[model samples]
Target: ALGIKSCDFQAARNNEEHHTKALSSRRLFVRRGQPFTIILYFRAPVRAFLPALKKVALTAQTGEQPSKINRTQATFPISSLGDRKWWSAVVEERDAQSWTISVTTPADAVIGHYSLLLQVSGRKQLLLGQFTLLFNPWNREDAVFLKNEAQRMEYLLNQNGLIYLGTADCIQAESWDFGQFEGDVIDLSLRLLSKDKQVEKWSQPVHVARVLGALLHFLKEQRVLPTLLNKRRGSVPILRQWLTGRGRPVYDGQAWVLAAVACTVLRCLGIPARVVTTFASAQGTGGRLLIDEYYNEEGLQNGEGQRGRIWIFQTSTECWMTRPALPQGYDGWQILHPSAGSCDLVPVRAVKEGTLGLTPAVSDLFAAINASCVVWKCCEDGTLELTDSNTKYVGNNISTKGVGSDRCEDITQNYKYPEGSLQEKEVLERVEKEKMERESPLYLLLKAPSSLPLRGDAQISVTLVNHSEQEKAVQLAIGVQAVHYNGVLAAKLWRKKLHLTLSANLEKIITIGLFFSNFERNPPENTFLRLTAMATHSESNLSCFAQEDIAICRPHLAIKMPEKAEQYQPLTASVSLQNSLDAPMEDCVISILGRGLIHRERSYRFRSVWPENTMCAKFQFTPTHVGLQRLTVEVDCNMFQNLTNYKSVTVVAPELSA
Candidate 1:
């Protein structure tokens, strides 16, 4: 009978039969640069293969489903370290009930699945099942970067969000291993995209970037946005739902979720990767990195002669993974942004040959270069002006978990050539000057309210200022538009014009009223009021412009709970939610989160919430850790933007006699 049972390295190494039991599994899993041992039992006597069995012959193939790209193969020798011992054995003749061979995996083995066969003299080779060799770059001893066990576990195994290492909230991973796709995550990654040959094709130069390209396409195609999900608001779904199969809607989420999923999937495949959060991130829409703040230059609006000109300020996050197949030095941590995209995110050699070096390819995108700062500028006509077609204005304050430490490390230097370096500044100025050649208008500035409430009316105001040496006549054309949380821009609410004479260096502000009345009441929760202002210098007809992004704040989950609770005492929470959308919402899910609050995670479902109607959910839990915590609630629906709210409560030990 054929019997090659379990492979247990620890038990066979140190004479320990007490814990040694032959496992009936066929395949053997081995870690790179590690030692492995397996016991083989024989029901029948050792006949043809026993003599040369001690001379172990091996072969390897890529774990992926057969592909023209996976021509990877190898042959190696495994030596018999010891003789007849129940725990460890070589070829034996007489009393052969079992045999054990200690196997050592090579340090440079490519990770994946491969079928192994044992070859013996004068006899056909017997199939010895398969071997899964995994390459773990996070293993301190086996890696050149992320060099430590603690960091390896944290980045690869720890399932939490890590934005700024200094942020109040600690990042955790929820679905790192919900992976169902077999083979490498890279192979798993390949199956997530459309089977379109151009998009899914993986060919020679079979390097790490092919997988990076695959990952970017997967996320872009998946349309995953973590801002909120219809299922569970605060909870992350399984990888099977995300990077793996046709699981969760995997529709959309914030940068954190994408980063979390990408990092989790990479780790699951044995590749070392980490999530990074940029405090002030940016994107160059038209292709430059500097924000073009063009005001009267009186430095008003804060006395800087500008009130938000060039770059848009937003916090963004992304992922970094090693590209081992690249040229030596480039194989370390390479930047890969999982932004909602248009074209592929990274370039595979076959797909973006010339562009990979430098061009409008994935390799040349803003986030790809590890640039320190990123920004995007939108003009009065809804046109986006990019800062650097190459690097600047991509991401700033770029940070990730420090090697072997809990602290966050400023990795900006690794990405950017120093923030204010002369070369970068000069590039910015040149792009700015070159891009404004077709401009015409007076220096116009649009000032918008910081935010507006969900229920009532709101106003929009804009400013016109002349910066020329002499007093000039200025003409202004202003319009307003409402943007749904889903990114649909509504019809223009209103547009008007005015002509006036402005003293040189003087600014005028106009208030446009009832901006909210233009849209249907209770629009999607994340909707925003957008203002566009265009001004013309009457004398020269030169156009000047500005656009403002006003936050459309809506009433969200209202919470009713005690301000204080004793530690270990069960606290009940009542949350009130209302549907603010014009259409009725079914499939509403409310997610609750708090540190030391609920026993673990609490989620409640709702059937439907009619337009403008409400729903309530109650949760019960005892505070485990003492101190103050914010109890937050989030509401999600298939047809609406995510709604969220929170409350703070103090948890103290029972009264102490004063």
Candidate 2:
């Protein structure tokens, strides 16, 4: 009897061809719509005399449910005339006792863990090996195909990325470690997919993305992490810790963290995904496209209940795919809110065209990026009067990381028409024409610096204009409070009241100074402050409201390193931060991270540093690969958290030294 000796899947060659060679070191991953080769050795020579063995076949099966086996199982006959749209195998080469088999999966094959088996003439099957099948971004027949090679490299292959934060005027980029191919991420992502009840729908990239989004939300809400300890960790470490059970119960992560994690899982599954940041994102409770904020005469928000809030910035994941569930034009980038469980994925095209009425999910997306903001003033008589209507306040400066570069790409125009444009006004009118919105007679403008230093007094200027021809007596109340990036109030900083009279068609400007002493005792969470103003007219009984959110700037880490280095040679780098604050900076820590250079983040901690002082730390490492690599350094302390800086180093082969 001729028996099987051994088998070789040619993992390295197949993975390289499929573009999944860098995804894992322990497992084989291949893509559909392409052929992968394997070799099999036999104990006896497979000569021409073995006529019975000429009719060999291969079986590829996925999913455990017997009822769904028809959809998940595929059989291919060797050297047989079969449909090219189905699985097929052919003998590419033959030796004395060894044979090389080339197997190809259909372009629409179910993507998941698949078991490969060889069958002989007697219906006897032997399990040869196992490998994971994923959507082919390089294949045009695949639904998730990305046409641009540079974009595919960035969105699908690149492991390091940046997430934009801060105000639209002062955009700041933060480093994020999206270790999609590191450690057990592939295994964990596959397990997550298999554990879903809708695993049968995993063939479609859209449904798989939806399941992934819902699963992440459930994990965040249910899991508890002892390792978190109310502290934030990088996304790579968070996933690694979760898999090893080192963090038994994972703590809830911020929007950016969730988006990073989602990106990792989606990319690991061979889907093109990226993290997006939307500035001034509106949180509309219902399907309403208007964000209503109510304030009293005392300049307090509690007077009348607040209806909606606008986050300084919100981050989410975007996936590229052809939408079979939607119309033809809706195929493109679709936004996925991982925290919003069961929310359907919203196509960016739908929001841009003001066609959100096509689905409930798209309506919410439109509100987040294109909603109008209305501010109301609650008088002493318990009457609410509309004071301000801002059409362009909810969304601004939508951004993502550019392909093959660390620069921030403004994608705001992709979500809606340009602000103040006729097309933009037409879209808004088509969506919310039922609201019958009106403008206020008194215009209020709150102006602040692009950013405030952590150790300086902040100045805010409020200008009021009387558009009507009558003289108006205005009662002004201004208040400043520390707030989180999610629009949550942390602590009150300052508040004041004033009275002024504006002549017909005249304007008045008031400057309010916020001392650093006020913030010294009550440090802002996320280093963000919200300044709000409420005004009431005594003669016309008209009320107006305005507010602005400002981010406190911290000293960035100054990174020093050589511009070029030789691979496999020792390299040195240093980072420094100057303490310009009036008070001592306590418990300062600096973290240095780089892919292919540092296995993990290296951190150095210090106790207390007095004012007008500088702290620096040095790091030594060796380059492993030859390419342009980026090094990111972040500083964390009681006063400032997550201030980051980046440097790029070009690595060359050691032969260049000769």
Candidate 3:
């Protein structure tokens, strides 16, 4: 129920004064064989303050230098400059945020990019702070560069090929991609860039101070007022107004980014401004979704205002907005959070200064998280090994847990039929919405349009069309295997393999005699027939994922009752999957609540994995008695994680008639 910051920070501890404090803010990307200082400072002095870290993992970008926390340390005994190089430090008192220890990077750390995090030794808490640790541009110079405004300027234009702009380590890297959103790039000449005075204004985002300085230097090169000159006003009226989205201006990416950078720059010039965000088809304060008309705005409205159909943000206090990124089909929309946080955001916004205008899509209504790759550990070169667990993957698996090189992000999600309870619902949300279900290779056209009766077989013939594109030079890597379940062909005698001269866009008609086993012709019980073409010929991994159900009689009858009490039942009893296909299906997932309910506390899974070959799921359930109540059931196949769709149906259980 509560598990966000738990994964990225240290634990809370009680000081000698009995004050509770939890400060676990260390995320780094480091290089090998470097002497890095691990500091835990304190304003006052005392003892008895010790923290338990669970595990320490050092991942490498390349090579084999990365290693987990291998060294050992004393329990609570606070020590000064220890004898060993790599060591741990404890807050000997309440205000011990200033404690210090020198940790030595593994010599093999020079492998590639690296990520590092130290779990509290004990407490079994799941948290791993991320950091950025490069081969400090110059051990002393870069250190001073971060401290001084002028040095940061020379550093940016001198190094990084980014003559347009320079980057500093202080700012939080753009959590999502810059190019994904259809908008203009925030040009450097358009606004100011730097990390100054943020520490005094927001205090929470002190993390971005380093990156801020570098950008400020880039602004100076563009002839913007130098932050160090102290010649600028406390706060510019126009810049602050734009940054906060207060002033009505033509909205676009260039304008947004420029406004954000301008505000930040002005602040560095000793002005105060806040970062804000907005969403497309988005509204403010009230429940509004600003949907843009799909057609071009020219002829339709003739001459509409500059604010056609888009949402933007304004500046404010401290907050962070992110998503379960790394989607499947396309890079989804980014949400914005300012001043406060809520679970209601299906779309988010961010206030940066840019003049880019992108329309929001319908699929962005559902929740799709963005992939976050914080620096886990650092190795040798500049390769940045990702830190977030979602970034790791085994193969072509799109399970909710792992993420491959996917462009769109699909976070932990569930599909629900509208018209259920009137709860805040997420509309069309598709982080990675790819339709890879290919057409069948054998275009079977029945000579007689034979209606294969249920539980019976029909002899048929068909033609084969090679839909494989011309780009595929070689013959189709053809392998036709029937659907099998538990080691046996769940599908009966179906055509395994028949070949036509493989050519792109070629259509061939071949007469082949084929026999269908009793089971192959018709599925038993409440079910249907599914013909799938299994071939992985093209770059698309899923060559075939098609399902054609035999619309038979009432195939599925489901009743959702709270697992908490059987006393509460469903309203409708004559439920069917056909009902789902025709009418808007609701109340699919069934949960019966009772004393011995397995899911009294957590979400109890009704089904884990489904048959790999067959693609139909029929649920037939009836309560012992009848009553007006709400029932919840989730019938998602565990072929993957994100497929867990939710169905909550209210019913009068005793309608016992499937």
Candidate 4:
């Protein structure tokens, strides 16, 4: 995502001074399939592609739905403007410093925010931006969201962490990192669109809806990849751009905007997409090795309400006008999140009104490198540092060259000060903006079953919340199983194995679950067991890992010799519940469990009762299945409050001698 627009770098590379042009919006907005003029601003000495083909590759990134693109036209070459393809533009060498292209969006196009890239002429390097294409279905009467996803969509119930988007055949996966925790005490201002400045009235739902749908499809597709791979051979293909005239800071964000758009389009088509932040080398230094944790949340800053780690979940928000960029390839990007423990909030350094010591304009941060490179500074001496790849800090503690793949902050060559040359007042004012500050992010922990141990059966839960104001719908699901072993308590351990698909509305309150008999039977011996719950919404998922400890032992009971000893028993029960998330639950009636009996005829009245934080009515029973019937307990809370959920458990009965 190089900024410092390639416009300045155009001639030097081709060894020829060629004129570059840019197209902008003549007006603020456009209707689907309606014609509008796109004004272009250009420099003199325009090189008209006469002997060369002046082709403009126009592509719009939004949600992928089979929305009709005014079927009347397929491709538009300004020369054939009569064909009615609105994206039509002309090739001319007029002396006009600014020009305009007349184009239109499909009437049936799904809405949301979309930015198309136009590759002009035959040069792959010469690019143009389409920031004016902020189309919204909500802006229309029959307004319906739409996206341009290239593949199918999928829906996943549970399973967090790293997930494949589309099919493995395509070798693509949308990785999400929710960080370490989530809760109410913290606030996370995770920018949806990371840029140097902000855009006005910037939102596009058609594209967002398309992205959401596509991500769901990605999850569904991963489940049946083998079948898909047999039929296909590549991963979901994505296009990256270096828009001309746009600064690196803006271009980088635009690239991510494209990534987020790809993610949204994929999600719109039902593909589960997420961003995975990885180090330059998937495998660390000396080929020793690299772990998923480090490379994953590498760029995400963990503090206060902000979950810390390498991976970060990017959903739609006011900042990006799109979803957060799922942590992806390294860009020396530093994600700023509040710290929890002794956590430090690195207050952003703003470029306040100040004076510089008149240093050389520093011609090129990338130096003499012909291609894209990196430019940062040394935290030690504050000297200007530059490089190509962000790998220089791949294994270092203090990043020398600040590759801003995740965050952007103020800088200085001893930047905190205005230097002695400036007046004392000017220096003091600038220093005020440079002083480092710190804060924290609200923490969110999986509120579901934290620990569990099973010898025979199991039960699970799923819940989540919006830690922020950003609107979203989360999908949660998980798997649980037990392993069998023969020996003593040490040898017969029902260990804990669980997955947590932690995610919420804002940035906290993660919840997900699982229940299973997916374990082995190693009766009388200690067996290891575990449970895991994974959750996803949009294109990313939050993963929480938990474990449980259990001991297996056969119980002794006497019975008449009329029959052989029973080996198993079963238990079943139902629950009625009222929600107290918004209100309080007073005098709640929970369950009263009994053995081998059914009392479906009993009821109770508070006689003046109300619901509190956890108000519910429950009944438990033992299974006649013999040795030990796994018992299930449930609590229904969908009746009284909004966010409703049920609680459960699994246990076996004592073996009896007949």
Best by lDDT: 2
lDDT score, candidate 3, position 257: 42
Off by over 4 Å in 4: 1-83, 86-132, 135-584, 587-658
Which residue segments of model 2 deviate by more than 4 Å?
49-53, 66-69, 80-85, 224-231, 237-253, 303-307, 337-341, 388-392, 433-443, 466-474, 500-506, 537-539, 606-608, 656-658
Candidate 2 local lDDT, residue 382: 82
Error of 1 at 367 (Å): 9.7
Per-residue error (Å), model 2, residue 532: 1.7
lDDT for each residue of candidate 3 in 237-318, tens digit (9 for 90 to 100): 2243333444323222122343234333322221122232211112221212222221110111112212222221112111
Give me the displacement of residue 482 in model 4, in angstroms: 24
- TM-score: model 2 vs. ground truth: 0.91
Clashes of 3: 130
lDDT of 2 at 61: 90
lDDT of 1 by residue, 580-620 (tens): 65567778777777645764556678778887888777788
Task: Order candidates by lDDT, high to low.
Answer: 2, 1, 4, 3
Per-model TM-score, in order, reads: 0.57, 0.91, 0.20, 0.19
RMSD of each: 10.6, 3.5, 26.9, 27.8
**Model 1's lDDT to the true fold?**
0.47
